[PDB]
Amino acid sequence: GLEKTVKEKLSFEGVGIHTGEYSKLIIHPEKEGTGIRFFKNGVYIPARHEFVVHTNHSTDLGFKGQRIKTVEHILSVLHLLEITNVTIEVIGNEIPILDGSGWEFYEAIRKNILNQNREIDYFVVEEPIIVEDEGRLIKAEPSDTLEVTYEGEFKNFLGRQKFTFVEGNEEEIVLARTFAFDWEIEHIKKVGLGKGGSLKNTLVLGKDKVYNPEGLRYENEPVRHKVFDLIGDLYLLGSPVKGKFYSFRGGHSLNVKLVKELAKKQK
Ligand SMILES: CCCCCCCCCCCCCC(=O)O
Ligand SMILES: [Zn+2]
Ligand SMILES: [Zn+2]
Ligand SMILES: [Zn+2]
Ligand SMILES: [Zn+2]
């Protein structure tokens, strides 16, 4: 496939789920071979694993004293549409959460794709690999197409659920919203996070209840969102990824751990 950028500048704005502050994005077109990077207060922060500085409740990047929180969703949408060259200018300290999914980003960027004059240099998983952490596990193996399966084992009514994404089914995961369980809200607030969270941008679940009056968009919306997250974190490898992935209870921390190991193996 050929590298792609956006036809023109695209802007998005809104509160950040963690900072609770208003932030704005301006997605700028870039020439072939530029790659995906963020720009904040005069500093360019490449969308690569070397710049990850936090992964507990979001994937955050930083460089030279400048930090940007929650890049997982915008990066996942860019990965899914195979946008390879753009500069995401951020005026604020975090990417706007919007409705908690990648829908708005997806609809806008998809309508503004510009093919360029260079073959994409994909990151191709060359051999099987497995990373684990406290019962959580993620496996990656060779594949001509990006395939991602996420299996969750939740302590509430969700129980055991599984979802598989395959190329062409992008729309099945870009609408899945971020979620949190009521029993983890106290901790998130205590560590200085989740300041912008609300039922408008977060699916809040209880042991046996869904607080959002609109309910779930899909009975397995939570696992679809986790697949969406992994695809965003996988883009930290530096280019569109070709491989088959299986994540069991994975999260941003384990996702980045996998990315770093795959990168080391210069796979
Ligand atoms: C009662 C209003 C709801 C408060 C929402 C708390 C903030 C949401 C935390 C974000 C959870 C996603 C964590 C992740 O990125 O893996
Ligand atoms: Zn090609
Ligand atoms: Zn924490
Ligand atoms: Zn996240
Ligand atoms: Zn997410």
Curated annotation (Swiss-Prot):
InterPro entries assigned: Ribosomal_Su5_D2-typ_SF (IPR020568), UDP-acyl_GlcNac_deAcase (IPR004463), UDP-acyl_GlcNac_deAcase_C (IPR011334), UDP-acyl_N-AcGlcN_deAcase_N (IPR015870)
Result when mutating residue 221 to A? 20-fold decrease in activity
UniProt record, GO biological process: lipid A biosynthetic process
Swiss-Prot/TrEMBL keywords: Hydrolase, Lipid A biosynthesis, Lipid biosynthesis, Lipid metabolism, Metal-binding, Zinc
Per the UniProt entry, the effect of residue 221 to S is: 15-fold decrease in activity
Catalysis: reaction(s):
a UDP-3-O-[(3R)-3-hydroxyacyl]-N-acetyl-alpha-D-glucosamine + H2O = a UDP-3-O-[(3R)-3-hydroxyacyl]-alpha-D-glucosamine + acetate
Family classification = Belongs to the LpxC family.
Q: What is this protein called?
A: UDP-3-O-acyl-N-acetylglucosamine deacetylase
State the taxonomy lineage: Bacteria, Pseudomonadati, Aquificota, Aquificia, Aquificales
